[PDB]
Amino acid sequence: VNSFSGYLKLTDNVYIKNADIVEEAKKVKPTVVVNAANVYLKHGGGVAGALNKATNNAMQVESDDYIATNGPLKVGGSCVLSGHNLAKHCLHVVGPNVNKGEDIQLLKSAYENFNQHEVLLAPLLSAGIFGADPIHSLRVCVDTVRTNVYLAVFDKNLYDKLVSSFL
């Protein structure tokens, strides 16, 4: 039993809710919140901009130190940093950005990072400003992630479409 409330169960291990991931994180304080990161951990907009704003820019300060030490992430890769006031940990995961021409096949590799964590609160990778089809992203999630994933979808119209078209 865990503290996530109001989710629709899609599969044995995947759950979905129309929610603001920032507000969901603030209330649940999950062990892991997933950020929709880029390779530079520049959290300017989308999910990343919103998560970072909710930390009063502490996420960006920590991220800049990480990059200065380690260099950029790989597309499809991840790193674990602090969750600040939102979660114990933040798993920064880089899905491919279609608006930069990155290979959508890397979306499966991105979701594989979730399997290193027993339970996660997450957005749909490569959705939103990353330019992928969120229905495809949900399919890859379901077919790749084996751990327990609680997906927060900000847009109510999109959430209803994801549910109604789910196979």
| Comparison of 20 and 112: residue with beta carbon closer to ligand WXO | 20
Minimum Å distance from CB 68 to ligand WXO? 27
| Comparison of 50 and 110: residue with beta carbon closer to ligand WXO | 50
Q: Which residues of this chain interact with ligand WXO, rule CB under 6 A? A: 20-22, 46-47, 50, 123-124, 127-128, 134, 152-155, 158
Q: What Rg do the C-alpha atoms of the chain give, in angstroms?
A: 15
Minimum Å distance from CB 70 to ligand WXO? 26
Q: Are 144 and 44 in contact (CB under 8 A)?
A: no
| Comparison of 94 and 124: residue with beta carbon closer to ligand WXO | 124
| Comparison of 19 and 81: residue with beta carbon closer to ligand WXO | 19
Q: Looking at beta carbons, which residue is closest to ligand WXO?
A: 128
Minimum Å distance from CB 129 to ligand WXO? 6
